[PDB]
Design a protein around this nucleic acid. Sequence first.
DNA 1: AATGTGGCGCAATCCT
DNA 2: TAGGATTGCGCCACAT
DNA 3: AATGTGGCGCAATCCT
DNA 4: TAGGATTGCGCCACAT
Lengths: 67, 65, 65, 67
Amino acid sequence: DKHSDEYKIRRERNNIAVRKSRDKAKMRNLETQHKVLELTAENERLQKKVEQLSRELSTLRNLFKQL
Amino acid sequence: DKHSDEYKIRRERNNIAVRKSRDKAKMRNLETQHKVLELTAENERLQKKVEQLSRELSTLRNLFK
Amino acid sequence: DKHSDEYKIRRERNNIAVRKSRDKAKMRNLETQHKVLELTAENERLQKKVEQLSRELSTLRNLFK
Amino acid sequence: DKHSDEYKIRRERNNIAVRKSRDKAKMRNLETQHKVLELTAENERLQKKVEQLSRELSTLRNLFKQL
DNA sequence: AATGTGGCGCAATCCT
DNA sequence: TAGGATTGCGCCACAT
DNA sequence: AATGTGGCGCAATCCT
DNA sequence: TAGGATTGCGCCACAT
């Protein structure tokens, strides 16, 4: 009975749940997009550190090798 | 008019476009979640590399003593 | 000359370039291995979708009987 | 003793192992690149199938909905 | 011990 | 020439 | 049972 | 105008 009073209230409750479920999903996605930006900045920091330490190690190894 | 052949083809075409658009969006969101897993593992790896390089520097500098 | 400052800077610069080139190559190879995992999971998903769509078609066509 | 006879033969054995290890790694990589091409063709086939079935289902659902 | 791997350095070359 | 990107050869530390 | 999710359809709009 | 891409609203089947 798609005209029933009970029907329309059942539909309304589900419509409310649907908007709630999707807001949550869209928020989660937004939080994830932010996490990527955060992890990217951290990745770049680590890359710079690895490069700096690698060059430091290389120079030191060369010194010893020159004895 | 809903019986109009033009209406019918319009709905048919739009339903295809709507599904295509929604799949693309789902794909992007999944990729973003994927990048988080990727970056997380990679940063973990680089951090390990940092620690390894530091140990190698310490080892060499111990030769001075 | 190996004592030449020019030689020393040449080695220093090349060692950086060599490491950079080797890391890039390692990255590409890891990505390729990654795509295999990705595609494998995705094809599995699409196959599941194919099966689901077929069940839905069967269900609707059963209404005719 | 990096001039020893034993040393040079030890180095030769490792050099042989290194080339063997790397050929294997490079082959594995080559096989993986091929697998990606194979999985990509399969992915495209599946995408086409999903699209075709989806349109088939949509048309059929519309028919019923028009009763 | 002996072979298998992974990271580098060198130097010739290729590339811009 | 300058200078970065590749790559064959091979040393070494470490893993299996 | 009641809410939470995922997939669609419609139709207004935006975009090319 | 034609026609594909988005997106707010909401129906429904199914999951939890």
